[PDB]
Structure formats: C-alpha cells, structure tokens
Amino acid sequence: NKTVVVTTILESPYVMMKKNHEMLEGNERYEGYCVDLAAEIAKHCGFKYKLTIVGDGKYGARDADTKIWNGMVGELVYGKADIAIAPLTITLVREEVIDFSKPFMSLGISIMIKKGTPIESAEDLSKQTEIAYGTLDSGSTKEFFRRSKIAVFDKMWTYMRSAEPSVFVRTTAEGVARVRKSKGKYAYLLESTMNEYIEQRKPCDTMKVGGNLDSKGYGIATPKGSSLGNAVNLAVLKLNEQGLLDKLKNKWWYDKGEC
Amino acid sequence: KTVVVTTILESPYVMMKKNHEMLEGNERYEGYCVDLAAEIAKHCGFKYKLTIVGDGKYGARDADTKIWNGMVGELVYGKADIAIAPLTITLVREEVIDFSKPFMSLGISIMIKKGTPIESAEDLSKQTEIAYGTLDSGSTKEFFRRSKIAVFDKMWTYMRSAEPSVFVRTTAEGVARVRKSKGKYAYLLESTMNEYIEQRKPCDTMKVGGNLDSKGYGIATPKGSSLGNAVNLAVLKLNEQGLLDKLKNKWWYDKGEC
Ligand SMILES: CC(C)S(=O)(=O)NCCc1ccc(CCNS(=O)(=O)C(C)C)cc1
Numbered sequence: 412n413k414t415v416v417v418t419t420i421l422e423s424p425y426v427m428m429k430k431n432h433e434m435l436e437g438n439e440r441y442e443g444y445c446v447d448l449a450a451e452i453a454k455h456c457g458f459k460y461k462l463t464i465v466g467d468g469k470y471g472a473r474d475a476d477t478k479i480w481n482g483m484v485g486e487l488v489y490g491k492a493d494i495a496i497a498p499l500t501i502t503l504v505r506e507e508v509i510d511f512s513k514p515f516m517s518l519g520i521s522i523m524i525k526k527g528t529p530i531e532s533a534e535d536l537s538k539q540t541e542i543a544y545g546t547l548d549s550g551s552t553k554e555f556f557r558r559s560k561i562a563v564f565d566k567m568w569t570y571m572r573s574a575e576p577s578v579f580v581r582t583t584a585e586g587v588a589r590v591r592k593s594k595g596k597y598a599y600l601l602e603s604t605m606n607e608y609i610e611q612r613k614p615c616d617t618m619k620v621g622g623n624l625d626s627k628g629y630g631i632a633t634p635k636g637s638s639l640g641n642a643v644n645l646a647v648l649k650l651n652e653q654g655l656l657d658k659l660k661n662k663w664w665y666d667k668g669e670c
Numbered sequence: 671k672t673v674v675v676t677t678i679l680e681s682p683y684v685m686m687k688k689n690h691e692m693l694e695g696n697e698r699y700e701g702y703c704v705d706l707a708a709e710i711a712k713h714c715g716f717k718y719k720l721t722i723v724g725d726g727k728y729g730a731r732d733a734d735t736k737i738w739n740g741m742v743g744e745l746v747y748g749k750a751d752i753a754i755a756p757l758t759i760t761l762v763r764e765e766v767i768d769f770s771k772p773f774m775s776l777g778i779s780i781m782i783k784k785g786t787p788i789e790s791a792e793d794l795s796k797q798t799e800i801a802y803g804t805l806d807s808g809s810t811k812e813f814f815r816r817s818k819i820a821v822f823d824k825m826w827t828y829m830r831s832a833e834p835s836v837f838v839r840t841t842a843e844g845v846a847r848v849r850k851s852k853g854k855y856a857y858l859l860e861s862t863m864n865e866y867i868e869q870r871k872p873c874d875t876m877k878v879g880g881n882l883d884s885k886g887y888g889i890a891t892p893k894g895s896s897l898g899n900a901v902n903l904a905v906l907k908l909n910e911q912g913l914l915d916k917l918k919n920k921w922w923y924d925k926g927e928c
C-alpha cells in the first residue's frame with residue numbers, strides 16, 4: 412500500500428485553507444466539503460492519502476493545439492495524482508481520458524447577478540447588451556457554451572467569445588468579485604452549487620436567478636483503469652445512501668450561511 | 671446480435687400506444703424510455719427488441735434464496751442484455767449489475783389526495799389516521815427498511831406491521847389507492863412519477879414536501895457486458911446535447927393536462 416496522492420482545488424466551500432493552517436501540517440491544513448469527503452472515501456476504501464492543491468489552479472481542459480491536458484484532469488492523465496476529489500464536472504470529453512464515479516453532487520449552470528440587476532433568465536441576458544456576462548475561462552461551463560447548438564446559448568456564446576475586454580475570469584472568486592464591483596453591469600455564469608454558496612455569504616449582495624441551464628454532476632475521478640475506481644464508486648453509493656453527502660452539503664452551505 | 675432490452679410498463683417511461691393492437695414489436699410502445707432506447711441504440715449501433723419484464727418488478731434479492739427478481743434478475747440470469755427503465759442506482763444492485771451515469775434525477779416523495787392535511791414525512795410519522803405505504807420489490811421500500819433517520823425508522827416500523835397491508839404491487843395501484851381513499855392513504859414514490867401523475871386528469875393528487883433523498887436512474891447491463899462502456903458514453907452525449915432535457919419536457923409537461 413502506498414499513500415494515495417489526491418489532487419484538489421482551492422474553491423470554497425469544497426477546499427479552503429484553515430485560518431490557522433501555518434501551525435498545522437499535511438492534510439490538517441485544509442477544510443471543506445471535499446476535505447470531509449476525501450477522509451470518508453479513504454476510510455471506506457482503506458487507503459492513506461495526501462491532499463495536494465493542483466499546481467496550475469485549473470479544473471482541466473485539453474489545449475486544441477498542443478493536445479495537452481491541464482488542471483486536475485492533467486494531473487491524473489500524466490500520473491502526477493492518483494485521484495481527484497473536487498467539484499470536477501463529469502463531461503464526455505473528460506470521461507474519454509479519465510474515469511468518474513457516479514456523481515456525488517448535482518448541479519447545473521446558473522446565473523449570478525448583483526441584487527437588483529434587471530435580469531431573470533439566460534434569454535434575458537442574450538437579448539441585451541447593457542449587462543456583460545461571462546464564465547470561468549477554463550472549465551466545463553465555458554465548453555457548454557462553446558459547444559451548444561441551442562439558439563439562446565449559441566447567441567450568448569457568440570457574444571462572450573468576442574466581447575472586449577474579456578468577460579472570462581481566471582477563478583470563481585474573480586468572477587464573484589467582478590459581479591460585486593460592477594454596479595449591476597456584469598452577470599456571472601457559474602455552477603448552481605457555487606452560486607448558492609456565495610448567495611449565503613456576506614455581504615449578501617448576489618443572487619441566483621432563473622432555472623439552471625443544464626443538469627449534471629461532480630464525480631470523483633481516477634486515471635483510466637485505476638485499481639481504485641470500483642471501490643471509490645461503491646463508497647460514493649454507500650455515502651449517498653447513508654445520507655452523509657446531504658449532511659455535508661448542509662454543513663458547508665447552509666449551517667454556516669451568513670445571510 | 672439483436673439486443674434484448676428489458677423494461678417495465680410505468681408511465682410515462684414505457685406505455686402501450688393507444689393503437690397498439692394493430693402494431694408489432696417495438697412499435698407497440700411509446701414513452702421516455704422508448705425514445706431513450708432508440709437514441710442509445712442509434713449511438714451505439716445496435717438493433718434491439720423491447721421486452722416487458724416478465725414479473726412486472728424492478729428488482730430485489732430474496733433474503734433466503736438470494737435469487738434476484740425483476741429487471742435486475744433478468745440481467746443477472748442472462749434473460750436480457752440491457753435494462754432501459756426508471757431503475758434506481760443502488761449499492762446492492764451495483765454489486766451484481768453495472769449502471770451508466772444517471773440519465774435522470776429523482777428523490778423519494780409523498781403523494782397526497784388534494785386537501786390531505788399532510789405537509790411532510792414528519793407529519794405522516796406523527797399520526798395514524800392517514801395510512802401510507804410504498805411499492806413492493808423496489809428501492810423506496812428498501813430505503814425505509816434500512817433507514818436510521820428517526821422519522822423514517824418510525825415510518826418503517828408502522829409500515830411493516832400495518833394491517834391491512836400498505837404496500838402495493840405497482841405504481842398504478844398506489845396511485846389508485848390514494849385517489850379512492852378519500853384522503854386516508856398517502857403514497858411514497860419517486861418524485862419523477864409523482865410529478866407526472868400530478869399533471870394528469872383527474873388532477874386530484876399533489877406532491878407535498880421536499881424529496882426524502884437524492885439519487886438517479888441508470889441504464890443497467892450485466893457485469894462485464896461489452897455494451898456497458900458505449901452505453902455510458904451515449905448517456906453522457908445525450909445529456910450534453912440537451913436531448914434528455916428535451917425528452918423529459920416531451921413526456922412530463924408538454925403532455926400535461928391539468
Ligand atoms: C446513486 C447516486 C450516487 S447517483 O449516482 O444518482 N448521484 C446523485 C446525484 C445526481 C443524480 C442524477 C444526476 C443527473 C445527471 N447525471 S450526470 O452523470 O451528472 C450527467 C453527466 C450524465 C446528477 C447527479
């Protein structure tokens with residue numbers, strides 16, 4: 412048995428630095444939903460592990476030119492990590508190079524506005540020019556728009572791909588900050604999970620509006636044909652059935668809500 | 671080789687067409703899972719035959735003989751090649767068959783006759799005037815059997831001992847029992863089926879409260895099936911094209927009559 416290298420990402424409330432992290436070591440430096448989940452998955456599958464934050468701070472995309480995978484997906488593909496336990500979206504292009512468990516959390520793409528912004532829907536955003544809108548610059552949300560053949564979303568993509576200055580952001584935090592500082596003139600397209608979390612954080616000035624644009628999930632990912640895939644999947648099923656995943660969601664989203 | 675698909679008559683997933691008696695083979699049926707089977711078959715490049723599960727059950731394991739019934743049994747014993755049905759992904763099933771990523775989300779929910787003074791599972795568990803039960807041989811019954819959550823444990827104790835029986839052989843039977851019991855029977859069933867019935871004449875039932883859990887239906891194949899991989903990728907593709915969302919609207923709400 413060797414220590415399992417876990418790749419993950421600093422994304423609230425999934426993985427965060429503990430206030431006193433400088434005084435702590437190894438796994439104890441972090442907290443959050445995915446930190447709690449990693450401990451349970453390791454316990455139920457019988458392995459020791461080490462949490463590592465993804466070097467480039469990215470989720471995972473393949474460069475169209477170089478064909479190289481970046482982010483957490485890259486760490487799995489190139490053998491730098493053994494498992495990714497993070498809000499990593501299950502997608503077809505990813506499933507072709509890595510394996511995912513059954514989804515441990517559901518989510519869909521959603522709209523974040525600064526409160527009072529006169530927008531209620533994706534259709535609203537597409538039919539106007541006063542309010543800019545964008546996505547995380549690398550990730551499944553961007554690809555959803557890039558690939559969509561649905562009229563409303565294709566229209567949004569045509570706008571976003573050509574908008575100047577860029578409407579895309581490097582991190583979720585950057586997108587949230589941009590909504591907060593843009594006096595209602597920027598809306599952010601991000602996953603419902605992160606949207607709902609931020610909605611419950613001070614200064615309580617953002618809101619999720621409209622229905623979700625799609626319906627998907629986060630999965631625990633392992634390299635193709637990993638020895639861990641089967642047991643990890645069974646552990647996700649057990650934890651779902653025992654209500655732990657619901658308990659953890661409540662713990663990190665709503666029990667700690669500031670609004 | 672023509673792929674034998676096991677499925678179950680459960681609205682709006684698989685239903686006999688109005689004019690079924692004059693039709694043959696797959697053409698006799700319509701519904702969400704009929705459309706899904708056609709899509710999966712197209713994207714995986716196979717011919718197939720839809721067959722309705724012989725015993726009318728989803729699938730559970732006999733505690734004594736360890737024999738599986740239902741669609742799960744058909745896969746386990748080699749009577750069918752794939753199940754395309756509202757079949758809930760569960761740990762005990764994943765141990766004997768393979769599931770695709772979930773093509774639809776659902777949770778256990780409460781169906782009441784309109785006007786029944788019940789708003790939650792907790793409400794049901796606190797009283798005795800209104801009886802309540804679940805489908806037999808399915809994942810909802812097992813949920814209550816295995817739950818340690820106090821409210822659900824309390825409900826199970828009541829349900830397992832209730833006389834006359836509160837359990838039903840089919841969803842349709844549960845729905846009929848709610849409709850005819852003058853508000854004195856509430857039915858525990860998956861949110862998907864509950865929300866469908868809520869939009870059907872005579873428009874006398876309602877879903878109340880939040881869902882009791884969060885899970886999904888998956889396409890199932892026998893362990894080590896050569897079809898498992900391709901079918902999973904097909905589900906991902908259909909999801910990403912918005913086709914699953916299209917089919918959900920087509921069968922739930924475009925056909926809504928309330
Ligand atoms: C048995 C449970 C562990 S579960 O496996 O039911 N998970 C519960 C959460 C959940 C259920 C259904 C869906 C629907 C979308 N499916 S998806 O794979 O995200 C898409 C990429 C095809 C998403 C997330």
Ligand SMILES: N[C@@H](CCC(=O)O)C(=O)O
Binds near residue numbers: 471501549551600
């Ligand atoms: N969960 C996404 C990142 C966030 C987003 O794209 O909105 C992914 O795995 O790429």
Ligand SMILES: N[C@@H](CCC(=O)O)C(=O)O
Binds near residue numbers: 729757858860
């Ligand atoms: N979908 C369930 C059947 C219906 C129910 O138990 O509510 C199963 O696969 O067992």
Ligand SMILES: [Zn+2]
Binds near residue numbers: 451454455
């Ligand atoms: Zn545990």
Ligand SMILES: [Zn+2]
Binds near residue numbers: 709712713
């Ligand atoms: Zn198709």
Ligand SMILES: [Zn+2]
Binds near residue numbers: 733734
């Ligand atoms: Zn028996």
